[PDB]
mmCIF file of all heavy atoms in Angstrom:
data_model
loop_
_atom_site.group_PDB
_atom_site.id
_atom_site.type_symbol
_atom_site.label_atom_id
_atom_site.label_comp_id
_atom_site.label_asym_id
_atom_site.label_seq_id
_atom_site.Cartn_x
_atom_site.Cartn_y
_atom_site.Cartn_z
ATOM 1 N N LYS A 100 -30.788 74.976 -142.638
ATOM 2 C CA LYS A 100 -29.437 75.117 -142.073
ATOM 3 C C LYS A 100 -29.401 75.131 -140.529
ATOM 4 O O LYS A 100 -28.396 74.747 -139.925
ATOM 5 C CB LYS A 100 -28.699 76.316 -142.676
ATOM 6 N N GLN A 101 -30.513 75.512 -139.911
ATOM 7 C CA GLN A 101 -30.586 75.657 -138.473
ATOM 8 C C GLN A 101 -30.957 74.359 -137.730
ATOM 9 O O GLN A 101 -30.404 74.100 -136.655
ATOM 10 C CB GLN A 101 -31.548 76.794 -138.085
ATOM 11 C CG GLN A 101 -31.114 78.155 -138.651
ATOM 12 C CD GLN A 101 -31.931 78.579 -139.877
ATOM 13 O OE1 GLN A 101 -33.009 78.017 -140.150
ATOM 14 N NE2 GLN A 101 -31.428 79.589 -140.613
ATOM 15 N N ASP A 102 -31.895 73.567 -138.270
ATOM 16 C CA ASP A 102 -32.197 72.239 -137.714
ATOM 17 C C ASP A 102 -31.214 71.228 -138.240
ATOM 18 O O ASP A 102 -31.172 70.091 -137.761
ATOM 19 C CB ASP A 102 -33.600 71.787 -138.106
ATOM 20 C CG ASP A 102 -34.671 72.674 -137.528
ATOM 21 O OD1 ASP A 102 -34.333 73.683 -136.883
ATOM 22 O OD2 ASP A 102 -35.851 72.353 -137.694
ATOM 23 N N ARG A 103 -30.448 71.637 -139.252
ATOM 24 C CA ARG A 103 -29.536 70.741 -139.986
ATOM 25 C C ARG A 103 -30.290 69.584 -140.671
ATOM 26 O O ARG A 103 -29.902 68.416 -140.585
ATOM 27 C CB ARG A 103 -28.387 70.259 -139.090
ATOM 28 C CG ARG A 103 -27.112 70.025 -139.853
ATOM 29 C CD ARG A 103 -26.191 68.986 -139.218
ATOM 30 N NE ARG A 103 -25.629 69.415 -137.939
ATOM 31 C CZ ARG A 103 -25.274 68.586 -136.956
ATOM 32 N NH1 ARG A 103 -25.398 67.260 -137.090
ATOM 33 N NH2 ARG A 103 -24.785 69.092 -135.830
ATOM 34 N N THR A 104 -31.372 69.929 -141.360
ATOM 35 C CA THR A 104 -32.249 68.924 -141.987
ATOM 36 C C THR A 104 -32.430 69.155 -143.484
ATOM 37 O O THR A 104 -32.429 70.298 -143.953
ATOM 38 C CB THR A 104 -33.649 68.901 -141.344
ATOM 39 O OG1 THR A 104 -34.278 70.180 -141.496
ATOM 40 C CG2 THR A 104 -33.600 68.478 -139.835
ATOM 41 N N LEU A 105 -32.544 68.057 -144.228
ATOM 42 C CA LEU A 105 -33.036 68.063 -145.576
ATOM 43 C C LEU A 105 -34.220 67.113 -145.613
ATOM 44 O O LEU A 105 -34.150 65.979 -145.126
ATOM 45 C CB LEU A 105 -31.961 67.674 -146.579
ATOM 46 C CG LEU A 105 -32.393 67.578 -148.068
ATOM 47 C CD1 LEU A 105 -32.656 68.961 -148.692
ATOM 48 C CD2 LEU A 105 -31.329 66.801 -148.866
ATOM 49 N N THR A 106 -35.342 67.616 -146.136
ATOM 50 C CA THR A 106 -36.593 66.869 -146.127
ATOM 51 C C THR A 106 -37.032 66.669 -147.574
ATOM 52 O O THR A 106 -37.028 67.619 -148.344
ATOM 53 C CB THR A 106 -37.678 67.607 -145.289
ATOM 54 O OG1 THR A 106 -37.188 67.870 -143.961
ATOM 55 C CG2 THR A 106 -38.952 66.792 -145.157
ATOM 56 N N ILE A 107 -37.350 65.417 -147.934
ATOM 57 C CA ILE A 107 -37.948 65.060 -149.233
ATOM 58 C C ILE A 107 -39.434 64.767 -148.951
ATOM 59 O O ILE A 107 -39.775 63.823 -148.192
ATOM 60 C CB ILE A 107 -37.255 63.830 -149.893
ATOM 61 C CG1 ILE A 107 -35.760 64.086 -150.187
ATOM 62 C CG2 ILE A 107 -37.890 63.519 -151.276
ATOM 63 C CD1 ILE A 107 -34.848 64.339 -148.947
ATOM 64 N N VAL A 108 -40.300 65.590 -149.556
ATOM 65 C CA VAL A 108 -41.718 65.462 -149.438
ATOM 66 C C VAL A 108 -42.282 65.062 -150.790
ATOM 67 O O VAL A 108 -41.952 65.667 -151.833
ATOM 68 C CB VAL A 108 -42.413 66.809 -149.043
ATOM 69 C CG1 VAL A 108 -43.798 66.562 -148.638
ATOM 70 C CG2 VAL A 108 -41.689 67.531 -147.940
ATOM 71 N N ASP A 109 -43.164 64.057 -150.777
ATOM 72 C CA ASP A 109 -43.994 63.762 -151.959
ATOM 73 C C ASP A 109 -45.450 63.576 -151.556
ATOM 74 O O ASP A 109 -45.764 63.327 -150.383
ATOM 75 C CB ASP A 109 -43.500 62.516 -152.662
ATOM 76 C CG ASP A 109 -43.699 61.288 -151.843
ATOM 77 O OD1 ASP A 109 -44.869 60.933 -151.556
ATOM 78 O OD2 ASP A 109 -42.647 60.670 -151.491
ATOM 79 N N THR A 110 -46.338 63.702 -152.524
ATOM 80 C CA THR A 110 -47.746 63.516 -152.272
ATOM 81 C C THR A 110 -48.110 62.219 -153.025
ATOM 82 O O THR A 110 -49.162 62.118 -153.700
ATOM 83 C CB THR A 110 -48.503 64.698 -152.791
ATOM 84 O OG1 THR A 110 -48.170 64.861 -154.182
ATOM 85 C CG2 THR A 110 -48.133 65.979 -152.018
ATOM 86 N N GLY A 111 -47.208 61.236 -152.936
ATOM 87 C CA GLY A 111 -47.503 59.888 -153.328
ATOM 88 C C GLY A 111 -48.542 59.181 -152.488
ATOM 89 O O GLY A 111 -49.300 59.792 -151.725
ATOM 90 N N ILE A 112 -48.594 57.868 -152.641
ATOM 91 C CA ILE A 112 -49.663 57.080 -152.067
ATOM 92 C C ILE A 112 -49.593 57.012 -150.540
ATOM 93 O O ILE A 112 -50.606 56.821 -149.877
ATOM 94 C CB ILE A 112 -49.793 55.662 -152.769
ATOM 95 C CG1 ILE A 112 -51.256 55.219 -152.769
ATOM 96 C CG2 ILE A 112 -48.883 54.638 -152.133
ATOM 97 C CD1 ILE A 112 -51.491 53.816 -153.302
ATOM 98 N N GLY A 113 -48.399 57.232 -149.982
ATOM 99 C CA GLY A 113 -48.209 57.259 -148.524
ATOM 100 C C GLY A 113 -48.187 55.853 -147.990
ATOM 101 O O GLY A 113 -48.316 54.914 -148.757
ATOM 102 N N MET A 114 -47.965 55.695 -146.680
ATOM 103 C CA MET A 114 -47.942 54.339 -146.131
ATOM 104 C C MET A 114 -48.905 54.123 -144.994
ATOM 105 O O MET A 114 -49.137 55.026 -144.191
ATOM 106 C CB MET A 114 -46.540 53.954 -145.701
ATOM 107 C CG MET A 114 -45.529 53.838 -146.827
ATOM 108 S SD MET A 114 -43.792 53.727 -146.196
ATOM 109 C CE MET A 114 -43.317 55.400 -145.945
ATOM 110 N N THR A 115 -49.483 52.923 -144.924
ATOM 111 C CA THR A 115 -50.333 52.543 -143.764
ATOM 112 C C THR A 115 -49.399 52.237 -142.595
ATOM 113 O O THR A 115 -48.161 52.075 -142.786
ATOM 114 C CB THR A 115 -51.148 51.269 -144.048
ATOM 115 O OG1 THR A 115 -50.244 50.199 -144.377
ATOM 116 C CG2 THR A 115 -52.116 51.488 -145.215
ATOM 117 N N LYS A 116 -49.955 52.133 -141.396
ATOM 118 C CA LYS A 116 -49.109 51.787 -140.216
ATOM 119 C C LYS A 116 -48.332 50.497 -140.486
ATOM 120 O O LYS A 116 -47.129 50.410 -140.229
ATOM 121 C CB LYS A 116 -49.957 51.610 -138.985
ATOM 122 C CG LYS A 116 -49.107 51.823 -137.687
ATOM 123 C CD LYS A 116 -49.862 51.443 -136.434
ATOM 124 C CE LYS A 116 -48.890 51.359 -135.262
ATOM 125 N NZ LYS A 116 -49.661 50.868 -134.101
ATOM 126 N N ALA A 117 -49.019 49.524 -141.080
ATOM 127 C CA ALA A 117 -48.451 48.226 -141.374
ATOM 128 C C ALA A 117 -47.278 48.304 -142.357
ATOM 129 O O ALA A 117 -46.196 47.757 -142.068
ATOM 130 C CB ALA A 117 -49.588 47.196 -141.822
ATOM 131 N N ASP A 118 -47.439 49.012 -143.489
ATOM 132 C CA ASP A 118 -46.310 49.152 -144.420
ATOM 133 C C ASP A 118 -45.145 49.827 -143.673
ATOM 134 O O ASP A 118 -43.998 49.382 -143.782
ATOM 135 C CB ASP A 118 -46.661 49.951 -145.682
ATOM 136 C CG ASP A 118 -47.843 49.349 -146.481
ATOM 137 O OD1 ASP A 118 -47.961 48.096 -146.535
ATOM 138 O OD2 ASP A 118 -48.649 50.163 -147.043
ATOM 139 N N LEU A 119 -45.433 50.877 -142.900
ATOM 140 C CA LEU A 119 -44.348 51.535 -142.191
ATOM 141 C C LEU A 119 -43.503 50.562 -141.406
ATOM 142 O O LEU A 119 -42.328 50.481 -141.635
ATOM 143 C CB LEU A 119 -44.849 52.640 -141.251
ATOM 144 C CG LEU A 119 -44.724 54.102 -141.653
ATOM 145 C CD1 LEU A 119 -45.181 55.013 -140.433
ATOM 146 C CD2 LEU A 119 -43.327 54.466 -142.167
ATOM 147 N N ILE A 120 -44.116 49.868 -140.454
ATOM 148 C CA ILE A 120 -43.497 48.750 -139.709
ATOM 149 C C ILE A 120 -42.801 47.677 -140.587
ATOM 150 O O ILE A 120 -41.682 47.223 -140.281
ATOM 151 C CB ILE A 120 -44.566 48.084 -138.838
ATOM 152 C CG1 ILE A 120 -45.040 49.106 -137.793
ATOM 153 C CG2 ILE A 120 -44.054 46.813 -138.283
ATOM 154 C CD1 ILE A 120 -46.381 48.790 -137.045
ATOM 155 N N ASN A 121 -43.462 47.276 -141.670
ATOM 156 C CA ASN A 121 -42.899 46.268 -142.573
ATOM 157 C C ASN A 121 -41.900 46.940 -143.511
ATOM 158 O O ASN A 121 -42.121 47.009 -144.717
ATOM 159 C CB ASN A 121 -44.019 45.647 -143.408
ATOM 160 C CG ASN A 121 -43.655 44.285 -144.029
ATOM 161 O OD1 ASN A 121 -44.484 43.717 -144.771
ATOM 162 N ND2 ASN A 121 -42.444 43.752 -143.749
ATOM 163 N N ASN A 122 -40.821 47.458 -142.948
ATOM 164 C CA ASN A 122 -39.752 48.074 -143.735
ATOM 165 C C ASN A 122 -40.182 49.128 -144.778
ATOM 166 O O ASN A 122 -39.645 49.176 -145.883
ATOM 167 C CB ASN A 122 -38.826 46.986 -144.330
ATOM 168 C CG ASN A 122 -38.434 45.942 -143.290
ATOM 169 O OD1 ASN A 122 -37.852 46.283 -142.258
ATOM 170 N ND2 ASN A 122 -38.770 44.666 -143.547
ATOM 171 N N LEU A 123 -41.145 49.970 -144.410
ATOM 172 C CA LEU A 123 -41.547 51.108 -145.259
ATOM 173 C C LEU A 123 -42.004 50.661 -146.660
ATOM 174 O O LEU A 123 -41.685 51.276 -147.668
ATOM 175 C CB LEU A 123 -40.420 52.164 -145.292
ATOM 176 C CG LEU A 123 -40.097 52.936 -143.980
ATOM 177 C CD1 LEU A 123 -39.134 52.205 -143.117
ATOM 178 C CD2 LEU A 123 -39.476 54.252 -144.290
ATOM 179 N N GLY A 124 -42.777 49.578 -146.714
ATOM 180 C CA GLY A 124 -43.249 49.031 -147.995
ATOM 181 C C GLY A 124 -42.241 48.164 -148.752
ATOM 182 O O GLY A 124 -42.553 47.635 -149.839
ATOM 183 N N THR A 125 -41.039 47.970 -148.211
ATOM 184 C CA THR A 125 -40.040 47.268 -149.014
ATOM 185 C C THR A 125 -39.942 45.737 -148.785
ATOM 186 O O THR A 125 -40.363 45.185 -147.755
ATOM 187 C CB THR A 125 -38.615 47.850 -148.833
ATOM 188 O OG1 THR A 125 -38.184 47.619 -147.483
ATOM 189 C CG2 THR A 125 -38.579 49.334 -149.137
ATOM 190 N N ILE A 126 -39.303 45.078 -149.741
ATOM 191 C CA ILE A 126 -38.922 43.682 -149.570
ATOM 192 C C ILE A 126 -37.504 43.684 -148.988
ATOM 193 O O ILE A 126 -36.553 43.161 -149.594
ATOM 194 C CB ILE A 126 -38.982 42.938 -150.920
ATOM 195 C CG1 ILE A 126 -38.463 43.823 -152.051
ATOM 196 C CG2 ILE A 126 -40.424 42.581 -151.246
ATOM 197 C CD1 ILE A 126 -37.021 43.699 -152.404
ATOM 198 N N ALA A 127 -37.368 44.299 -147.823
ATOM 199 C CA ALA A 127 -36.050 44.683 -147.363
ATOM 200 C C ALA A 127 -35.186 43.452 -147.073
ATOM 201 O O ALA A 127 -34.118 43.372 -147.583
ATOM 202 C CB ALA A 127 -36.092 45.667 -146.237
ATOM 203 N N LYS A 128 -35.686 42.486 -146.322
ATOM 204 C CA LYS A 128 -35.006 41.205 -146.114
ATOM 205 C C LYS A 128 -34.399 40.542 -147.384
ATOM 206 O O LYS A 128 -33.225 40.225 -147.404
ATOM 207 C CB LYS A 128 -35.957 40.234 -145.403
ATOM 208 C CG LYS A 128 -35.462 38.796 -145.333
ATOM 209 C CD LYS A 128 -36.128 37.993 -144.176
ATOM 210 C CE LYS A 128 -35.443 36.654 -143.902
ATOM 211 N NZ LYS A 128 -36.118 36.012 -142.697
ATOM 212 N N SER A 129 -35.192 40.305 -148.423
ATOM 213 C CA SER A 129 -34.644 39.653 -149.623
ATOM 214 C C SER A 129 -33.858 40.644 -150.471
ATOM 215 O O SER A 129 -32.899 40.273 -151.127
ATOM 216 C CB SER A 129 -35.724 38.923 -150.432
ATOM 217 O OG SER A 129 -36.772 39.807 -150.737
ATOM 218 N N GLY A 130 -34.246 41.912 -150.421
ATOM 219 C CA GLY A 130 -33.535 42.959 -151.140
ATOM 220 C C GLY A 130 -32.124 43.069 -150.615
ATOM 221 O O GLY A 130 -31.184 43.126 -151.387
ATOM 222 N N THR A 131 -31.972 43.077 -149.300
ATOM 223 C CA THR A 131 -30.643 43.076 -148.662
ATOM 224 C C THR A 131 -29.804 41.893 -149.100
ATOM 225 O O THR A 131 -28.623 42.053 -149.351
ATOM 226 C CB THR A 131 -30.741 43.007 -147.136
ATOM 227 O OG1 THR A 131 -31.592 44.050 -146.696
ATOM 228 C CG2 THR A 131 -29.410 43.203 -146.504
ATOM 229 N N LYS A 132 -30.408 40.713 -149.159
ATOM 230 C CA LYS A 132 -29.740 39.526 -149.677
ATOM 231 C C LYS A 132 -29.230 39.700 -151.115
ATOM 232 O O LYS A 132 -28.041 39.487 -151.380
ATOM 233 C CB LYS A 132 -30.646 38.282 -149.558
ATOM 234 C CG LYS A 132 -29.987 36.963 -149.981
ATOM 235 C CD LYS A 132 -31.037 35.852 -150.123
ATOM 236 C CE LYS A 132 -30.473 34.574 -150.757
ATOM 237 N NZ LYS A 132 -31.390 33.418 -150.447
ATOM 238 N N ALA A 133 -30.138 40.051 -152.035
ATOM 239 C CA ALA A 133 -29.784 40.219 -153.438
ATOM 240 C C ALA A 133 -28.742 41.321 -153.566
ATOM 241 O O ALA A 133 -27.846 41.212 -154.412
ATOM 242 C CB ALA A 133 -31.048 40.519 -154.307
ATOM 243 N N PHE A 134 -28.844 42.366 -152.725
ATOM 244 C CA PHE A 134 -27.831 43.437 -152.673
ATOM 245 C C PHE A 134 -26.508 42.849 -152.243
ATOM 246 O O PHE A 134 -25.553 42.839 -153.018
ATOM 247 C CB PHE A 134 -28.251 44.575 -151.725
ATOM 248 C CG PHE A 134 -27.378 45.817 -151.783
ATOM 249 C CD1 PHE A 134 -26.796 46.255 -152.961
ATOM 250 C CD2 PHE A 134 -27.206 46.595 -150.651
ATOM 251 C CE1 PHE A 134 -25.998 47.433 -152.999
ATOM 252 C CE2 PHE A 134 -26.425 47.778 -150.691
ATOM 253 C CZ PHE A 134 -25.837 48.182 -151.871
ATOM 254 N N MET A 135 -26.454 42.358 -151.006
ATOM 255 C CA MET A 135 -25.261 41.671 -150.466
ATOM 256 C C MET A 135 -24.510 40.835 -151.518
ATOM 257 O O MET A 135 -23.290 40.931 -151.640
ATOM 258 C CB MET A 135 -25.678 40.767 -149.315
ATOM 259 C CG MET A 135 -24.985 41.066 -148.013
ATOM 260 S SD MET A 135 -25.573 42.581 -147.237
ATOM 261 C CE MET A 135 -24.564 43.822 -148.013
ATOM 262 N N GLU A 136 -25.252 40.031 -152.275
ATOM 263 C CA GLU A 136 -24.677 39.153 -153.301
ATOM 264 C C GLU A 136 -24.209 39.887 -154.554
ATOM 265 O O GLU A 136 -23.367 39.371 -155.299
ATOM 266 C CB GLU A 136 -25.686 38.110 -153.755
ATOM 267 C CG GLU A 136 -26.155 37.163 -152.716
ATOM 268 C CD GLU A 136 -27.367 36.398 -153.217
ATOM 269 O OE1 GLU A 136 -27.607 36.415 -154.448
ATOM 270 O OE2 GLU A 136 -28.086 35.786 -152.393
ATOM 271 N N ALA A 137 -24.804 41.051 -154.821
ATOM 272 C CA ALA A 137 -24.386 41.876 -155.945
ATOM 273 C C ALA A 137 -23.037 42.490 -155.619
ATOM 274 O O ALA A 137 -22.151 42.517 -156.497
ATOM 275 C CB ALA A 137 -25.424 42.937 -156.271
ATOM 276 N N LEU A 138 -22.879 42.931 -154.365
ATOM 277 C CA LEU A 138 -21.602 43.445 -153.839
ATOM 278 C C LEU A 138 -20.478 42.378 -153.803
ATOM 279 O O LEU A 138 -19.302 42.706 -153.983
ATOM 280 C CB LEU A 138 -21.770 44.085 -152.447
ATOM 281 C CG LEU A 138 -22.794 45.197 -152.169
ATOM 282 C CD1 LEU A 138 -22.878 45.539 -150.658
ATOM 283 C CD2 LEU A 138 -22.545 46.478 -152.995
ATOM 284 N N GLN A 139 -20.839 41.117 -153.563
ATOM 285 C CA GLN A 139 -19.871 40.011 -153.639
ATOM 286 C C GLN A 139 -19.361 39.904 -155.075
ATOM 287 O O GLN A 139 -18.147 39.784 -155.307
ATOM 288 C CB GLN A 139 -20.487 38.675 -153.169
ATOM 289 N N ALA A 140 -20.288 40.044 -156.027
ATOM 290 C CA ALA A 140 -20.027 39.773 -157.444
ATOM 291 C C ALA A 140 -19.764 41.007 -158.351
ATOM 292 O O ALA A 140 -19.982 40.933 -159.579
ATOM 293 C CB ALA A 140 -21.178 38.878 -158.033
ATOM 294 N N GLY A 141 -19.303 42.123 -157.782
ATOM 295 C CA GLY A 141 -18.965 43.287 -158.614
ATOM 296 C C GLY A 141 -19.632 44.652 -158.393
ATOM 297 O O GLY A 141 -19.060 45.691 -158.776
ATOM 298 N N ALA A 142 -20.820 44.675 -157.784
ATOM 299 C CA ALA A 142 -21.570 45.934 -157.570
ATOM 300 C C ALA A 142 -20.895 46.876 -156.600
ATOM 301 O O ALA A 142 -19.916 46.517 -155.951
ATOM 302 C CB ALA A 142 -23.008 45.657 -157.094
ATOM 303 N N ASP A 143 -21.427 48.090 -156.511
ATOM 304 C CA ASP A 143 -21.041 49.028 -155.449
ATOM 305 C C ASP A 143 -22.314 49.610 -154.798
ATOM 306 O O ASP A 143 -23.394 49.412 -155.310
ATOM 307 C CB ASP A 143 -20.081 50.119 -155.985
ATOM 308 C CG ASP A 143 -20.769 51.111 -156.911
ATOM 309 O OD1 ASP A 143 -21.361 50.662 -157.907
ATOM 310 O OD2 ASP A 143 -20.721 52.334 -156.640
ATOM 311 N N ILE A 144 -22.177 50.310 -153.674
ATOM 312 C CA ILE A 144 -23.319 50.836 -152.916
ATOM 313 C C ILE A 144 -24.346 51.658 -153.758
ATOM 314 O O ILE A 144 -25.544 51.603 -153.470
ATOM 315 C CB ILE A 144 -22.841 51.560 -151.606
ATOM 316 C CG1 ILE A 144 -22.408 50.526 -150.570
ATOM 317 C CG2 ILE A 144 -23.905 52.475 -150.996
ATOM 318 C CD1 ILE A 144 -21.461 51.059 -149.571
ATOM 319 N N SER A 145 -23.895 52.351 -154.816
ATOM 320 C CA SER A 145 -24.793 53.123 -155.684
ATOM 321 C C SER A 145 -25.873 52.266 -156.358
ATOM 322 O O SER A 145 -26.936 52.778 -156.717
ATOM 323 C CB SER A 145 -24.002 53.957 -156.718
ATOM 324 O OG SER A 145 -23.897 53.324 -157.991
ATOM 325 N N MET A 146 -25.633 50.962 -156.493
ATOM 326 C CA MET A 146 -26.613 50.093 -157.116
ATOM 327 C C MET A 146 -27.772 49.692 -156.201
ATOM 328 O O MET A 146 -28.756 49.123 -156.661
ATOM 329 C CB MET A 146 -25.918 48.889 -157.781
ATOM 330 C CG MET A 146 -25.027 49.389 -158.924
ATOM 331 S SD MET A 146 -23.483 48.524 -159.266
ATOM 332 C CE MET A 146 -24.109 47.264 -160.367
ATOM 333 N N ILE A 147 -27.668 50.070 -154.927
ATOM 334 C CA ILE A 147 -28.666 49.809 -153.856
ATOM 335 C C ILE A 147 -30.128 49.872 -154.296
ATOM 336 O O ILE A 147 -30.907 48.969 -153.985
ATOM 337 C CB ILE A 147 -28.434 50.742 -152.598
ATOM 338 C CG1 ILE A 147 -29.228 50.260 -151.376
ATOM 339 C CG2 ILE A 147 -28.711 52.198 -152.929
ATOM 340 C CD1 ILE A 147 -28.895 50.950 -150.078
#
């Protein structure tokens, strides 16, 4: 409440410097595209 923060911690596989830079392991570029087009065709932000 004092820093005004909520933190999600996991002890998953973690990321290398490279994955971090490359959109945190994601296919973010094409994912954004497929998302964008889902929103054109009926989706809402919850389907992200």
Side-chain angles (χ1 to χ4, degrees), residues 101-138 140-147:
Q101 300 103 16
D102 296 4
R103 212 207 293 152
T104 60
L105 177 72
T106 305
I107 299 63
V108 193
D109 67 63
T110 55
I112 212 185
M114 294 168 276
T115 58
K116 203 189 167 185
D118 303 324
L119 257 186
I120 296 164
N121 200 183
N122 313 302
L123 293 86
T125 66
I126 39 93
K128 170 158 192 176
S129 54
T131 307
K132 184 192 171 161
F134 189 35
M135 238 73 274
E136 298 167 16
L138 306 173
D143 71 304
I144 285 156
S145 97
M146 296 146 87
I147 194 170

